[PDB]
RNA sequence: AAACUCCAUAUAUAUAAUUUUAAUUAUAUAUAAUUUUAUAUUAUUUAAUAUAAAGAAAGGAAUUAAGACAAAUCAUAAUGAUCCUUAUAAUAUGGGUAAUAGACGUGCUAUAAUAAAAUGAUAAUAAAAUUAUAUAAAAUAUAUUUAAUUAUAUUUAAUUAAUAAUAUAAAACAUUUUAAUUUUUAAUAUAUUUUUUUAUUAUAAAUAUGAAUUAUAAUCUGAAAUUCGAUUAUAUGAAA
RNA sequence: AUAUAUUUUAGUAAUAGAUAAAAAUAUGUACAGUAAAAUUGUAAGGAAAACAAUAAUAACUUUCUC
């Protein structure tokens, strides 16, 4: 069917592939989703501020 | 491409292991007994059934002999050789012998006779035929922690089994134990329910102790206990014997290697050390009549050690460890070993042997038919080198020249 | 001298002048062991016929000079 | 002639359902030539590595701060400059 | 049957001898030393080895220099020889005998396997 | 001996933090373990803010994922490394790369 | 040609204070055989076969004529003729004679069990020959935890020799082992084959043949071992 | 730590993006995008394999900020 070299190539391919290695989707509650949004937005704002500070300097 | 019936082995092995003793004449010969040696002093004698049973178990009858020639292994009694040795054994205070002689003279036969005598006179026999097995490295071994020496728990098991079977159980179970003994259990039955076997002091027996079956690492402990028990008991005599003791003497270091790659010393093993202790005045048996009978083999190497141990040569200090080990000599001197030289056959003895062979129908036609009997005997004596029994036998049967 | 004791095989050369000023050393020795004291010196080692230019290797330190000047021509067969 | 792995029918990733390849990675500490440790994410399972030949001991990366070796080892008792002066007559060339 | 470090082994094959036969880095002495370290009786057979015992030989084998790296050192040595305009390196490149031999006749083994990539 | 439409090697565009890490690894681990490497050439590059160089199969065995196990990788392949900057011209890009500990050896244009 | 000759043989004599001993020897001088005799059986007084009695009585070496082959040699050496004479004569340093497609002889080692390997210190059994341009003993050290073996180093005891050394001859013979071979091993029992037997379980075309080829480390000789020498060790283990 | 039973995993295989000029379904429909050449480079790579880069931001919307 397959050689040892062929097997090892398949194994190598598998290492890179998403076949049966990836978890379930990250589902959130609506409150949790909001909390996440507020975390991300604030962070983004902070990053923008920092960029402006550096740019201004 | 081999069947069960066909002979696949080499010659010596074949002669030992393929039963060609089957096709042989039944011979109503007299029976070997020390109490009635006066009757059968210079005659061929078959062993008793019990003796045979014991002797086979021990490992007295060996491969390179011509025991295939007859129905069962047979010897003759000899006034100069065997009878004299027996008398010495009976009489001496030390009772501690090494059977020396030239190759093929009949040392193993002498040992077999001594064993047979011991069997007759209600004695236990611990025979170590071929120490090469424990000395050369061809079975498992392990460094025990309690006993500061290397145990060998394949050989040991076999030796224990031989001891059990060679000796009768009535004599062996007359001995009560001195101490209590815990051992690891190793039965197929009750492995969950019985991981530990216990032998009590008065209730249990030496037979029971022998029948114990442990894991390899407790086998050496078991052996040690058994030896101690036998030393303690004064009810029955213990005949210890070691044939091919020449190998032991010469092979000072075994083929086994410890953790670091170097050869293990014979006295650092369990078996060889034990044997040495038995030889010397150290593990002293409580009973009288309890002997050690060692035997040299012409097969094995020769060197200065054994002569130096005996009253033969002065001690040269400069000769090498390989050709002279002084520790072994010292040990031999400690336990007063009086050597016994096996003498070569007389003319009359040779004649008697030849007559026996003729009766059994081993002689060739050119020997028997058209030849004077006395002349034939004289020729046989000449060709043996004046009565080397093996050589004589070879000339008789294995010549065809 | 091959054997480690009594080694190496030393020969007199115009070494110091070569070290001062890049003047190649025309050796007809071929059995002088290369040393650490001349790595990066230009040698012109004899080949029987013609002297061979070599800048002594940093790895050549153990070897002889004649080992890097191959005396015989590379064999071929005229397929006639 | 051409050595290959022959393809099976491809699995249909639906539009929107495609997920990004987040490979399994460990936080790995690299101690360089000197004792400066640096954390890097790595796919091979080894929490700690210490390096021998790095930029922090290479002369090119810090200018301000084995036949020869074998020879030195096995001609060490002699100690082989003075030796150069002894064995350098510049007459013959 | 009894696998150890990838190399297959028939039963009844004496361990040290078997190791010497199979593994590239080791001969007679090395195999004996390994056996001593692990504590197998000499002339013990490959079938007798328990699972813990097998692993320690593999653990021992792994600790010892073996196979591709050992081959690489020798291939590396020949690569080094080649790099420096050396006679030996030249012989290796051209598939002739290296050790000061005659080649007017009988130089067939050298031709067969005096490569830069030596071993296989 | 090359056909059309045959899978032959691979590429990967790194951007942001992974790219930065890869550069840091190149500077510290890999490019010092190359024995005789002077630098990236000063004649290398685009006309506008892009510099490049390549690693042999010998050089890839110094990467710690490769480096940790020689045994898993019997074969190993060289690679080209195209660095793309936000530089107007190439000398500016070279200067930037030097700031991140990349040595530059050749005679500049 | 044969014979005389030499070696070897048998016998005798001589010599050797039987510590230069091996008298079971060595070496001078003899004698001895190209053996003799008789009874018969075939072919014609003899000649072959057989038998018998008398004897130690049976080989090898050197010697290879005349002629021939215009056989080989001017590279052992010499000489004729001829050619070279700052070169075809003379000295040094390196290289070559050891190059490698195919081919051809001679050998060596192999392709394993009527055959290979370990071991064998009251050291199983020889002969012939060499040692002042030397032979190198015992013993110590390292390779190597014992020691022996083998190889080097250390240092020269003895003898320039029937006196000492090279040198404990080796096969032999004996025990052990041996893949191919589930023709074996090891766990249990088993027993009047016990260095072994039986039962039931598990043991699944180049090796534990061969030694080419190569890598590294040492050693030896020599002033020098790269082309281009010889050992030892650890790996490598083609072909067959 | 280990034994049995009952399960669960390991068949290890590529696209992860509405993919966009390597090759492959050549007719429908829906959605989206832009090619090529030449030039400058880069490990083997060379005139010729692959990858990168190569026209202009005025005004507009949102975000941060002086
Ligand atoms: N004393 C004796 N020996 C015998 C008799 N029958 C045979 N033998 C021989 O005795 C020999 C045993 O001798 P042994 O000393 O064991 O030989 P070694 O093993 O070489 O020492 C055997 O080879 C037998 O052939 C007998 O009736 N009496
Ligand atoms: Mg015997
Ligand atoms: Mg090997
Ligand atoms: Mg003549
Ligand atoms: Mg004498
Ligand atoms: Mg003539
Ligand atoms: Mg002629
Ligand atoms: Mg001629
Ligand atoms: Mg002339
Ligand atoms: Mg001339
Ligand atoms: Mg010359
Ligand atoms: Mg020649
Ligand atoms: Mg000839
Ligand atoms: Mg053979
Ligand atoms: Mg000596
Ligand atoms: Mg002498
Ligand atoms: Mg001998
Ligand atoms: Mg083959
Ligand atoms: Mg071999």
PDB file of C-alpha atoms in Angstrom, chain E residues 6-119:
ATOM      1  CA  UNK E   6      14.098  -0.028  15.209  1.00  0.00           C
ATOM      2  CA  UNK E   7      16.295  -2.995  14.206  1.00  0.00           C
ATOM      3  CA  UNK E   8      14.454  -6.330  14.063  1.00  0.00           C
ATOM      4  CA  UNK E   9      15.905  -9.420  15.742  1.00  0.00           C
ATOM      5  CA  UNK E  10      15.236 -13.135  15.402  1.00  0.00           C
ATOM      6  CA  UNK E  11      14.851 -15.059  18.666  1.00  0.00           C
ATOM      7  CA  UNK E  12      17.653 -17.317  19.953  1.00  0.00           C
ATOM      8  CA  UNK E  13      20.150 -14.656  18.745  1.00  0.00           C
ATOM      9  CA  UNK E  14      22.764 -14.061  21.457  1.00  0.00           C
ATOM     10  CA  UNK E  15      22.256 -10.454  22.565  1.00  0.00           C
ATOM     11  CA  UNK E  16      25.760  -8.910  22.399  1.00  0.00           C
ATOM     12  CA  UNK E  17      26.506 -10.665  19.088  1.00  0.00           C
ATOM     13  CA  UNK E  18      23.153  -9.560  17.679  1.00  0.00           C
ATOM     14  CA  UNK E  19      23.841  -5.948  18.744  1.00  0.00           C
ATOM     15  CA  UNK E  20      27.288  -6.098  17.095  1.00  0.00           C
ATOM     16  CA  UNK E  21      25.771  -7.435  13.864  1.00  0.00           C
ATOM     17  CA  UNK E  22      22.990  -4.845  13.587  1.00  0.00           C
ATOM     18  CA  UNK E  23      24.093  -1.516  15.070  1.00  0.00           C
ATOM     19  CA  UNK E  24      26.684   0.430  13.069  1.00  0.00           C
ATOM     20  CA  UNK E  25      28.512   2.150  15.945  1.00  0.00           C
ATOM     21  CA  UNK E  26      29.270  -1.012  17.946  1.00  0.00           C
ATOM     22  CA  UNK E  27      31.355  -4.185  17.559  1.00  0.00           C
ATOM     23  CA  UNK E  28      32.229  -6.939  20.039  1.00  0.00           C
ATOM     24  CA  UNK E  29      33.731  -5.038  22.991  1.00  0.00           C
ATOM     25  CA  UNK E  30      31.092  -2.285  23.036  1.00  0.00           C
ATOM     26  CA  UNK E  31      28.214  -4.803  23.009  1.00  0.00           C
ATOM     27  CA  UNK E  32      29.794  -6.722  25.916  1.00  0.00           C
ATOM     28  CA  UNK E  33      30.212  -3.469  27.887  1.00  0.00           C
ATOM     29  CA  UNK E  34      26.550  -2.602  27.247  1.00  0.00           C
ATOM     30  CA  UNK E  35      25.464  -6.068  28.440  1.00  0.00           C
ATOM     31  CA  UNK E  36      27.611  -5.708  31.579  1.00  0.00           C
ATOM     32  CA  UNK E  37      26.112  -2.274  32.323  1.00  0.00           C
ATOM     33  CA  UNK E  38      22.580  -3.656  31.978  1.00  0.00           C
ATOM     34  CA  UNK E  39      23.411  -6.951  33.718  1.00  0.00           C
ATOM     35  CA  UNK E  40      22.555  -9.675  31.209  1.00  0.00           C
ATOM     36  CA  UNK E  41      24.386 -12.977  31.545  1.00  0.00           C
ATOM     37  CA  UNK E  42      26.695 -13.622  28.557  1.00  0.00           C
ATOM     38  CA  UNK E  43      25.133 -15.872  25.886  1.00  0.00           C
ATOM     39  CA  UNK E  44      21.654 -14.640  26.889  1.00  0.00           C
ATOM     40  CA  UNK E  45      19.318 -14.759  23.907  1.00  0.00           C
ATOM     41  CA  UNK E  46      17.176 -11.982  22.416  1.00  0.00           C
ATOM     42  CA  UNK E  47      13.881 -13.823  23.151  1.00  0.00           C
ATOM     43  CA  UNK E  48      14.661 -13.913  26.913  1.00  0.00           C
ATOM     44  CA  UNK E  49      14.631 -10.089  27.210  1.00  0.00           C
ATOM     45  CA  UNK E  50      11.728  -8.567  29.162  1.00  0.00           C
ATOM     46  CA  UNK E  51      10.221  -5.193  28.171  1.00  0.00           C
ATOM     47  CA  UNK E  52      12.094  -3.104  30.811  1.00  0.00           C
ATOM     48  CA  UNK E  53      15.391  -4.745  29.776  1.00  0.00           C
ATOM     49  CA  UNK E  54      14.813  -3.937  26.084  1.00  0.00           C
ATOM     50  CA  UNK E  55      14.195  -0.251  26.844  1.00  0.00           C
ATOM     51  CA  UNK E  56      17.493   0.144  28.728  1.00  0.00           C
ATOM     52  CA  UNK E  57      19.468  -1.184  25.726  1.00  0.00           C
ATOM     53  CA  UNK E  58      17.610   1.389  23.606  1.00  0.00           C
ATOM     54  CA  UNK E  59      18.333   3.960  26.322  1.00  0.00           C
ATOM     55  CA  UNK E  60      21.949   2.728  26.319  1.00  0.00           C
ATOM     56  CA  UNK E  61      22.105   2.709  22.494  1.00  0.00           C
ATOM     57  CA  UNK E  62      20.717   6.265  22.406  1.00  0.00           C
ATOM     58  CA  UNK E  63      23.388   7.385  24.921  1.00  0.00           C
ATOM     59  CA  UNK E  64      26.150   5.797  22.808  1.00  0.00           C
ATOM     60  CA  UNK E  65      27.261   7.312  19.489  1.00  0.00           C
ATOM     61  CA  UNK E  66      25.510   5.355  16.718  1.00  0.00           C
ATOM     62  CA  UNK E  67      24.524   5.127  13.064  1.00  0.00           C
ATOM     63  CA  UNK E  68      23.873   8.261  10.972  1.00  0.00           C
ATOM     64  CA  UNK E  69      25.898  10.727  13.046  1.00  0.00           C
ATOM     65  CA  UNK E  70      28.743   8.199  13.348  1.00  0.00           C
ATOM     66  CA  UNK E  71      28.473   7.660   9.581  1.00  0.00           C
ATOM     67  CA  UNK E  72      28.227  11.459   9.180  1.00  0.00           C
ATOM     68  CA  UNK E  73      31.486  11.949  11.143  1.00  0.00           C
ATOM     69  CA  UNK E  74      33.171   9.569   8.672  1.00  0.00           C
ATOM     70  CA  UNK E  75      31.326  11.176   5.724  1.00  0.00           C
ATOM     71  CA  UNK E  76      32.169  14.577   7.313  1.00  0.00           C
ATOM     72  CA  UNK E  77      35.810  13.482   7.589  1.00  0.00           C
ATOM     73  CA  UNK E  78      35.856  12.550   3.892  1.00  0.00           C
ATOM     74  CA  UNK E  79      34.058  15.827   3.035  1.00  0.00           C
ATOM     75  CA  UNK E  80      36.747  17.681   5.018  1.00  0.00           C
ATOM     76  CA  UNK E  81      39.491  15.726   3.212  1.00  0.00           C
ATOM     77  CA  UNK E  82      37.919  16.616  -0.150  1.00  0.00           C
ATOM     78  CA  UNK E  83      37.633  20.327   0.732  1.00  0.00           C
ATOM     79  CA  UNK E  84      41.382  20.701   1.194  1.00  0.00           C
ATOM     80  CA  UNK E  85      43.189  19.856  -2.080  1.00  0.00           C
ATOM     81  CA  UNK E  86      44.424  16.599  -0.563  1.00  0.00           C
ATOM     82  CA  UNK E  87      45.570  13.392  -2.254  1.00  0.00           C
ATOM     83  CA  UNK E  88      43.219  11.199  -0.191  1.00  0.00           C
ATOM     84  CA  UNK E  89      40.274  13.501  -0.934  1.00  0.00           C
ATOM     85  CA  UNK E  90      41.163  13.389  -4.647  1.00  0.00           C
ATOM     86  CA  UNK E  91      41.214   9.563  -4.547  1.00  0.00           C
ATOM     87  CA  UNK E  92      37.810   9.523  -2.809  1.00  0.00           C
ATOM     88  CA  UNK E  93      36.352  11.815  -5.491  1.00  0.00           C
ATOM     89  CA  UNK E  94      37.708   9.719  -8.380  1.00  0.00           C
ATOM     90  CA  UNK E  95      36.703   6.288  -6.931  1.00  0.00           C
ATOM     91  CA  UNK E  96      40.251   4.896  -6.690  1.00  0.00           C
ATOM     92  CA  UNK E  97      41.961   3.141  -3.753  1.00  0.00           C
ATOM     93  CA  UNK E  98      43.102   5.673  -1.136  1.00  0.00           C
ATOM     94  CA  UNK E  99      45.599   3.751   1.046  1.00  0.00           C
ATOM     95  CA  UNK E 100      48.707   3.747  -1.188  1.00  0.00           C
ATOM     96  CA  UNK E 101      47.712   0.679  -3.200  1.00  0.00           C
ATOM     97  CA  UNK E 102      48.367  -0.561  -6.738  1.00  0.00           C
ATOM     98  CA  UNK E 103      45.697  -0.151  -9.421  1.00  0.00           C
ATOM     99  CA  UNK E 104      47.318  -1.667 -12.554  1.00  0.00           C
ATOM    100  CA  UNK E 105      45.029  -4.568 -11.674  1.00  0.00           C
ATOM    101  CA  UNK E 106      42.719  -5.373  -8.723  1.00  0.00           C
ATOM    102  CA  UNK E 107      41.125  -2.094  -7.615  1.00  0.00           C
ATOM    103  CA  UNK E 108      37.495  -3.175  -8.040  1.00  0.00           C
ATOM    104  CA  UNK E 109      36.195  -2.823  -4.468  1.00  0.00           C
ATOM    105  CA  UNK E 110      37.541   0.748  -4.305  1.00  0.00           C
ATOM    106  CA  UNK E 111      35.813   1.590  -7.614  1.00  0.00           C
ATOM    107  CA  UNK E 112      32.577   0.101  -6.288  1.00  0.00           C
ATOM    108  CA  UNK E 113      32.408   2.044  -2.972  1.00  0.00           C
ATOM    109  CA  UNK E 114      35.100   4.764  -2.570  1.00  0.00           C
ATOM    110  CA  UNK E 115      32.624   7.633  -2.833  1.00  0.00           C
ATOM    111  CA  UNK E 116      32.401  10.863  -0.828  1.00  0.00           C
ATOM    112  CA  UNK E 117      29.018   9.556   0.350  1.00  0.00           C
ATOM    113  CA  UNK E 118      30.646   6.328   1.558  1.00  0.00           C
ATOM    114  CA  UNK E 119      28.275   4.161   3.420  1.00  0.00           C
TER     115      UNK E 119
END
